[PDB]
Write an enzyme that holds these catalytic residues in place. Structure first.
Site, PDB file in Angstrom:
ATOM      1  N   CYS A 224       0.455  -1.471   0.081  1.00 12.65           N
ATOM      2  CA  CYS A 224      -0.019  -0.146  -0.067  1.00 12.65           C
ATOM      3  C   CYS A 224       0.888   1.214   0.059  1.00 12.65           C
ATOM      4  O   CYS A 224       1.355   1.194   0.654  1.00 12.65           O
ATOM      5  CB  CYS A 224      -1.141   0.120   1.076  1.00 12.65           C
ATOM      6  SG  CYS A 224      -0.854   1.542   2.573  1.00 12.65           S
TER       7      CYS A 224
ATOM      8  N   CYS B 250       0.498   3.613   3.796  1.00 16.91           N
ATOM      9  CA  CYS B 250       1.410   3.247   3.827  1.00 16.91           C
ATOM     10  C   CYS B 250       2.571   3.252   4.516  1.00 16.91           C
ATOM     11  O   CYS B 250       3.124   4.392   5.681  1.00 16.91           O
ATOM     12  CB  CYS B 250       0.862   1.617   4.788  1.00 16.91           C
ATOM     13  SG  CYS B 250       0.303   0.812   3.577  1.00 16.91           S
TER      14      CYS B 250
END
Ligand code: MG
Ligand code: ZN
Lengths: 375, 274, 45, 97, 189, 97, 109, 288, 317
Positions: free
Chosen positions: G33, G36
């Site tokens: 991701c 993140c």
């Protein structure tokens, strides 16, 4: 009946759901069409994710910001906070031309915070101590007038996660259908529901039934239908084992009387369509500037959805034409690639080493030239 | 070529020499230097600021240019200097006749007018716009001359008329009709038509087309009352009440382009004054 | 208010026109007309 | 109104052609040019004698002329001076080829 | 810069390769000369030399030709140039080098827009020389400076850092304008 | 002279339309030795799935650079007289004698 | 080195049982991701600001799918803010959230 | 930070049929500005798509040149008036439209009956004027194309007359450059000016042109799925029988390299040659 | 699909010359736009790597000569300006040459850093005819265009060379008719010649990417202290509400001040999206908007006043 006086040509589309900043529902292994030889030569300076995983898409606010860019008239219905985050989120939408009349703000609830009980041994938390503003919406607050003007409704499975909210959402869907609307359901399965297939099909069956158009990622289609993947998923060639067009019969178990079209997406690399009398696919580009921040490929998802909405809305009579559908699909692949590219340029790259760059109050970023420095 | 009539291009190295006193004042006035000696040093290191000050000083100050054999008044004329990089002086194409100048080794000299009284005289009595007519009989001295003339001739030259355009007599057996001139100019760009292709343009004004005194080739008259008159370069449609319903002109894109430029320039100058 | 010309322009004709324009409009207007005709001539050539 | 004259009008004002037009208006009120040159020179001297430090990038002769035009009803900027809205930064020079 | 047939000119602009005119082979021309010069100056020699140069480059030949070749036959030079251009066109397959409808001329395109210029043009490789008169030697400027002993006037010469002359003819011109103040200045301050 | 080139150029346009794209451009590819009739092209689409365009692309893959350079007379922008293109050597020589 | 330290699922369990005197912040993250990666950077600043007045730890979701399903992760960028007094509740924040917001919660809850 | 940015510096709406905008782009490295301008101007003037009236069917009469009844205007003038009508649409395919009015005195304008997708930019535009009571009925056809002016004219099955269509929404476009370079480096600014017919705003046209351009260059990036001594040897030296030699020399084969270049099928075209001979040439070569 | 591309021919004439030809059914005006843009990008927008400065240890000047070497220092420097190199990263790097003895110093003798690589391997730098020691130091960079040798002033032993960083030698294009009758379709062909630092196909791809990056800026948001930050909207507003009255007014949108829908829809259509817009617009003007009543002006004023006291143009004289 203020319709004659005030409706307007581009038909209103309403996106229902939660407004969030940078939220990814899930992530699954995937494949992409790329030039393998370039990647070897430019190994030093290109970010290529080691294992490629693709997000299904993003939150409904993201789909709305995207339609507005393409020219559509869009409204967002949902609930947020009057806390600073909320007020700021509404500003983004407003600056990007998404109508915010349908949003409702509440004093007591908070924007992204859900108070939760510590729970039983095994750390099984209970989330009912206090619901968050997003999942706390009531039937009374739904704005009927916006629903009346709109000829399209878009919703996701995330708004079906909380128990009260599920009810609210199903009502919005049913109210719209009667008044006259096409309902578009995007199954973007979140993290909890991947435990098993049977559980998933049952959770979403009511929604699947009420929808005129549905969009499912290939990996999701397999998960619901049953197939287990047999593709390499980490190799340096494009082999056709990946990128398969499932035969019409494998898909036929899931049809219902009201379903006009089903779109299955492998990313911008391939998009497939299935309609009762015809089946086909169109091909595209996925080798795009990728940064560490943008590797998830969420932006492409939102862009693809927006293109399909714009086209279907402007000439409603042809949703089932073979030609229109092919032209729509090509416009979608293009919108997706533009969006992934733009994001990379906006967000930038994380400092490679020698990180003496000035830091923004929260984080640090650099341009591509900078990333590509000698040591 | 791109310069306007009132402007000239002066190499920067020449300028710094001619306008030095003026720049020193500026450096001191802006307090970027303490003393005259202090400033002269800044001028030598070619620091970037010296250049911003030079530009400011020469903005409304004219300069005088002369060629060596100064046969007649027009040998000296005045211009507003524009800084250029490189070591040659750039001159407008149309001022060369007066100076009798060509671009194969000719050189020129520059002088700067110091006093206020001198500066007024140069702007008001020695600039090209004010001196467009020659002293001897009254003729124009600045007129388009070589390549420019070639271009004007080509635009207005015309088109093949008879045997040249059609192989066989037209008896046994142009088309475009345009409503406004803008459309026509547009088609030329989109390559729909060529410069010489004949076209018909609606004219709303009053018969200004220079043409011979020729009676109509054919008048076609219909029973209800409208008459169409075909002359060589024009069609006039008239009715029973004797009113001219329409006028159409046969022409080429090139002709409309010259007219439009002359007209637009007049209107533009007018709208600017306001 | 100008004539529409449907025949060629040669050097004699341009001198006559510049002369005629100086008398009707004056030296200021004529200078602008002249710069504009120059641009058109260079471009077409 | 002719449809597309915008650029030409921007340029006429920017180029300094406005000044040329003005000199001509003003000489249409005078029998001897030579005297008018002398009158303008005198006014400029009075202006510089009275406030010396204003001038240097603003020129006095230009100020006298702008003042005449503004008195008669045509708005002109003071000393025909215009800023460059789009200059990149300090110490940057436009290349007016 | 100059060629060997009486043609001289001064450089006015240097442009990037992309904006230069280009041929049907893709290459961009190095220099561009005015074509209105030949009729006035009467040198048709250059046209014969440019065309033969193109041929030799393509076929790898150098040609040394003695003067007055028409002694052998009428129109001898034309026969040499046209024949050589044809051989080059055939051996290296470039059909533009010899065009039967307009021999010696071809159609070229504009770098800025990609569009063809309307009429065919003369292209060739001639020999061009650079002359001793250069700008760097020519430029001069002066403010203030050293002054002469008796006349107490400015010094003469770029080397000597001197002024420029306002002489008899120049005074007369200034007088015609009626610019008395300007003139007095030149004579005094 | 112009009236005649135009007539010759119009005839070339017409042959391309009747014969088809693969056949017209095969004068300049001499290594293709395969039937180029419109009826031959349809049969290949039925048997292998490759349409006209794919077949045309394959032909050009067999052309020499020398031959490509000769095909430039067929350019839309700067078309060459069809007679000049196909003229014999004997004929051209007579231009100079 | 990094102040933030990756932790296994089991070890977290131990922490919940044992006593605590400064707030623990748990970040569930995944390598894939994009948000993140940005989130990690901002938490790191907070670690400096708090300076031993808190413990911040991270668990990778892909390795521990079950632990995550139990603590109710819904989407990938998720933070759980927990407290010493075991009667006061926990806070789950979903999505990138600004730093000032993070700061307020640690102080007032 | 050295990030290209775009702003709109001037805007003006003169009539419902004319709009103007001026746009700017951030500092660009040298050489960049002119390429960007040339391409944009081409896209704006040719790639944007417009909707206009292609064909008109007047049922009242078949005469090529006859004013009919009340109308004060000619058949040809009406055809011209119709071509000047501006429309906005998002159509795929074609459509039909009609105008029907019954007026003693008429100012025919804005009476067109349109499908919901098509829209009319200016109501006032005058199609025609009828002096006497009569019924006017016209049928029209409307299409969307990118400024491609025409196709071959089709058959006039009825009194259906074609109209020459210019499908161009943007009326003019121009570009300019300013270069502000000092000290170490040079920066440039592109200025773009767009005028439109009111079907779209200038800003919208700007965006559309950029998108059209990008799709043109995306195809190059697509990736598909995956499943001389001989010269100096002449035939005279290799003994060959006469009939074959004379035949080869007839067809311009002079050196060995050349025989190799030739193929068995090719040989059977030269006349007087025999298949057995092809075998013999193979045998002669075989010995090498 | 419909549009297809391919490489029709590819050749390597020399180690320093490479060739390629490519083919592309295109619509009527598309080919010209593609061709011109590609030429301008190929000859103009692609970058390359070259030697930029040299350190010769013990020479008085460049127009001198040295024993055992057949060439002057100026000639050695010119030969270096012709060396071909390949790298993908920016910044300056250092390399050296140290051959000895009778022979030839060629490109192979350069020792390089890990990122830069030579292409030819046979290019000649100097001719050595005695037993001598040749030691030189070199600096390499990646940039675009050409460099003027501005730093004439130099550290001892260092001399600069005007590098040309363009990797594409030449380009051409042609457009022909597909002969489809009424639909006018066309075929495009492009040819590229390269120095061998990069393949012609790679140049074709690099050019396409560079072109998209020059047309993509327009689709971002209009500009109206640090970019490249996720939270640019939030931080901007935080200042906008805090910093100025009459500017906070921009923040408020008609959507928030609730209005009945008929009114809201009409206002939006008529380009009114914000309050500062409403306050600015005249009462009379509201009557101008179509389907706007007399009752509504009242409604708007009544709701507005409750929200805020000010009437900038809202109040008539
Ligand atoms: Mg001379
Ligand atoms: Zn001779």
């Amino acid at each position: 009946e203020d319709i004659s006086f005030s409706y307007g040509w581009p038909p209103l589309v309403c996106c229902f759901g939660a407004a969030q900043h940078a939220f990814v529902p899930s992530g699954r292994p995937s494949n992409r069409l790329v030039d393998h030889e370039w990647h070897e030569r430019m190994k030093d300076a290109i970010w290529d994710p080691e294992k490629f995983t693709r997000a299904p898409g993003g939150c409904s606010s993201n789909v709305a910001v995207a339609l507005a860019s393409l020219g559509g008239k869009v409204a967002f219905m949902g609930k947020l906070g009057d806390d600073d985050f909320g007020q700021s989120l509404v500003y983004f939408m407003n600056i990007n031309k998404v109508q915010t009349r349908s949003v409702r703000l509440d004093s007591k609830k908070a924007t992204a915070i859900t108070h939760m009980k510590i729970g039983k041994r095994g750390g099984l938390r209970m989330t009912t101590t206090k619901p968050s503003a997003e999942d706390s919406l009531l039937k009374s607050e739904i704005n009927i007038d916006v629903l009346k003007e709109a000829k399209m409704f878009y919703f996701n499975t995330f708004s079906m996660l909380d128990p009260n909210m599920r009810l609210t959402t199903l009502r919005a869907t049913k109210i719209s259908k009667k008044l006259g609307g096409v309902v578009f359901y995007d199954v973007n399965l979140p993290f909890p529901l991947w435990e098993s297939g049977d559980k998933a099909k049952t959770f979403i069956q009511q929604a699947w039934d009420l929808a005129d158009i549905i969009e499912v990622t290939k990996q999701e289609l397999e998960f619901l239908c049953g197939i287990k993947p047999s593709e390499r998923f980490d190799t340096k060639d494009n082999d056709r084992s990946k990128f398969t067009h499932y035969p019409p019969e494998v898909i036929a178990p899931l049809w219902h009387e009201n379903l006009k079209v089903l779109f299955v997406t492998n990313g911008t690399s391939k998009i497939h369509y299935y309609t009762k009398e015809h089946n086909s696919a169109v091909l595209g580009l996925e080798d795009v500037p990728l940064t560490p921040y943008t590797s998830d490929m969420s932006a492409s998802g939102d862009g693809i959805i927006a293109g399909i909405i714009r086209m279907l809305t402007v000439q409603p009579h042809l949703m089932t034409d073979k030609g229109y559908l092919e032209r729509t699909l090509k416009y979608a692949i293009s919108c997706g690639v533009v969006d992934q590219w733009l994001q990379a340029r906006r967000l930038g790259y994380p400092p490679k080493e020698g990180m003496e760059d000035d830091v923004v109050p929260d984080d640090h970023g650099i341009k591509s030239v900078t990333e590509r420095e000698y040591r | 070529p791109s310069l306007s009539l009132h402007r000239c291009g002066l190499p920067r190295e020449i300028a710094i020499e001619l306008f030095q006193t003026f720049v020193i004042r500026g450096l001191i006035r802006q307090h970027l230097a303490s003393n005259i000696g202090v400033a002269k040093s800044k001028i030598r290191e070619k620091e970037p600021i010296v250049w911003e000050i030079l530009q400011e000083v020469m903005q409304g100050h004219p300069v005088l240019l002369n060629r060596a054999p100064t046969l007649h008044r027009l040998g000296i004329q005045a211009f507003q200097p524009v800084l250029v990089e490189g070591r040659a002086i750039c001159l407008h194409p149309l001022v060369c006749k007066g100076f009798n100048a060509d671009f194969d080794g000719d050189q020129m000299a520059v002088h700067v007018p110091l006093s206020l009284e001198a500066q007024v005289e140069a702007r008001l009595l020695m600039f090209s716009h004010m001196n467009l007519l020659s002293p001897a009989i009254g003729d124009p001295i600045s007129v388009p001359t070589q390549d420019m003339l070639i271009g004007l001739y080509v635009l207005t030259s015309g088109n093949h008329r008879g045997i040249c355009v059609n192989r066989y007599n037209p008896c046994n057996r142009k088309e475009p009709f345009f409503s406004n001139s803008y459309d026509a100019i547009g088609a030329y760009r989109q390559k729909r038509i060529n410069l010489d292709s004949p076209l018909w343009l609606r004219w709303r004004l009053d018969q200004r087309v220079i043409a011979s005194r020729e009676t109509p080739i054919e008048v076609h008259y219909e029973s209800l009352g409208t008459f169409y008159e075909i002359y060589g370069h024009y069609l006039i449609v008239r009715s029973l009440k004797k009113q001219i319903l329409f006028i159409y002109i046969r022409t080429t894109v090139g002709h409309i382009a010259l007219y439009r430029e002359i007209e637009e320039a007049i209107q533009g100058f007018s709208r600017a004054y306001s | 208010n100008l004539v529409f010309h449907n025949k060629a322009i040669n050097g004699t004709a341009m001198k006559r026109l510049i002369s005629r324009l100086i008398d009707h409009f004056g030296m200021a207007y004529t200078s602008h007309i002249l710069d504009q005709v120059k641009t058109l001539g260079f471009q077409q050539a | 109104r002719i449809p597309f004259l915008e650029e030409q009008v921007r340029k006429i004002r920017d180029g300094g052609k406005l000044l040329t037009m003005d000199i001509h208006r003003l000489l249409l009120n005078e029998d001897n040019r030579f005297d008018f040159v002398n009158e303008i020179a005198a006014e400029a001297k009075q202006y510089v004698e009275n406030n010396r430090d204003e001038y240097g990038a603003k020129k006095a002769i230009l100020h006298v002329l702008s003042n005449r035009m503004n008195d008669a009803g045509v708005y002109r900027a003071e000393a025909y001076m215009e800023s460059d809205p789009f200059k990149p930064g300090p110490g940057y020079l436009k290349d007016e080829l | 810069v100059a060629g060997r047939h009486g043609n001289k000119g001064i450089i006015s602009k240097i442009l990037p390769r992309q904006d230069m005119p280009y041929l049907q082979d893709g290459r961009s021309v190095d220099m561009v000369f005015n074509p209105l010069g030949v009729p006035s100056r009467m040198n048709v020699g250059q046209i014969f030399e440019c065309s033969l140069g193109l041929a030799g480059s393509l076929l790898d030949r150098h040609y040394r030709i003695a003067p007055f070749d028409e002694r052998y036959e009428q129109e001898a030079s034309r026969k040499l140039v046209f024949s050589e251009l044809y051989e080059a066109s055939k051996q290296t397959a470039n059909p533009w080098v010899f065009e039967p409808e307009y021999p010696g001329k071809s159609r070229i395109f504009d770098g800025r827009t990609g569009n063809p210029f309307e009429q065919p043009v003369i292209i060739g490789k001639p020999y061009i020389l650079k002359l001793i008169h250069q700008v760097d030697d020519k430029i001069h400027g002066r403010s203030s400076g050293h002054y002469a002993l008796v006349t107490q006037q400015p010094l003469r010469g770029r080397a000597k850092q001197g002024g420029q002359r306002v002489g008899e003819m120049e005074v007369w011109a200034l007088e015609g304008f009626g610019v008395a103040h300007i003139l007095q200045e030149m004579l005094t301050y | 002279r112009h009236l005649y080139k135009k007539e010759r150029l119009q005839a070339e346009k017409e042959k391309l339309e009747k014969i088809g794209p693969i056949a017209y451009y095969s004068e300049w590819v001499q290594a293709w030795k395969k039937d180029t009739s419109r009826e031959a092209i349809q049969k290949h689409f039925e048997e292998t799935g490759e349409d006209e365009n794919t077949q045309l692309i394959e032909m050009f893959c067999h052309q020499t650079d020398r031959e490509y350079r000769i095909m430039m007379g067929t350019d839309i922008r700067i078309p060459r007289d069809p007679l000049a293109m196909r003229m014999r050597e004997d004929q051209i020589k007579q231009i100079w004698g | 080195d990094y102040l933030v330290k990756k932790v296994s699922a089991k070890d977290i369990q131990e922490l919940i049982k044992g006593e605590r005197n400064v707030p623990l912040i748990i970040d569930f993250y995944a390598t894939w991701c994009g948000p993140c990666i940005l989130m990690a950077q901002e938490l790191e600043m907070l670690a400096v600001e708090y300076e031993s007045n808190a413990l911040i730890v991270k668990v990778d979701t892909d390795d521990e799918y079950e632990f995550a399903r139990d603590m109710q992760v819904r989407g990938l960028p998720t933070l759980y803010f927990i407290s010493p007094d075991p009667n006061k509740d926990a806070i789950r924040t979903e999505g990138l959230i600004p730093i000032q917001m993070m700061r307020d919660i640690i102080n007032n809850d | 930070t050295r990030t290209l940015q775009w702003k709109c510096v001037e805007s003006r709406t003169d009539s419902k049929r004319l709009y103007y905008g001026r746009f700017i782009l951030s500092p660009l490295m040298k050489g960049q500005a002119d390429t960007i301008g040339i391409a944009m101007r081409r896209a704006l003037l040719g790639e944007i798509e417009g909707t206009c009236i292609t064909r008109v069917k007047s049922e009242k009469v078949p005469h090529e040149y006859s004013t009919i009844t009340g109308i004060q205007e000619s058949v040809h003038e009406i055809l011209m008036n119709l071509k000047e009508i501006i429309l906005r649409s998002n159509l795929y395919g074609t459509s039909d439209a009609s105008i029907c009015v019954k007026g003693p005195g008429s100012v025919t304008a804005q009476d067109i009956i349109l499908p919901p997708y098509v829209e009319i930019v200016d109501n006032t535009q005058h199609i025609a004027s009828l002096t006497e009571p009569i019924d006017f009925c016209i049928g029209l056809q409307i299409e969307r194309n990118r400024g491609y002016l025409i196709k071959t004219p089709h058959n006039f099955q009825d009194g259906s007359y074609p109209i020459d269509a210019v499908f161009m929404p943007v009326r003019n476009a121009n570009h300019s450059i300013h270069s502000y370079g000092n000290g170490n480096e040079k920066q440039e600014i592109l200025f773009l000016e767009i005028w439109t017919n009111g079907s779209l705003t200038p800003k919208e046209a700007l965006h559309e042109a950029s998108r059209n351009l990008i799709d043109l260059f995306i195809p190059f990036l697509h990736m598909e799925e995956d499943n001389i001594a001989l010269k100096s040897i002449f035939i005279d030296q290799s003994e060959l029988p006469s009939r074959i030699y004379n035949c080869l020399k007839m067809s311009n084969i002079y050196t060995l390299l050349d025989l190799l270049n030739n193929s068995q099928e090719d040989l059977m075209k030269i006349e007087h040659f025999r298949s057995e001979d092809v075998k013999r040439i193979l045998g002669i070569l075989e010995k090498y």
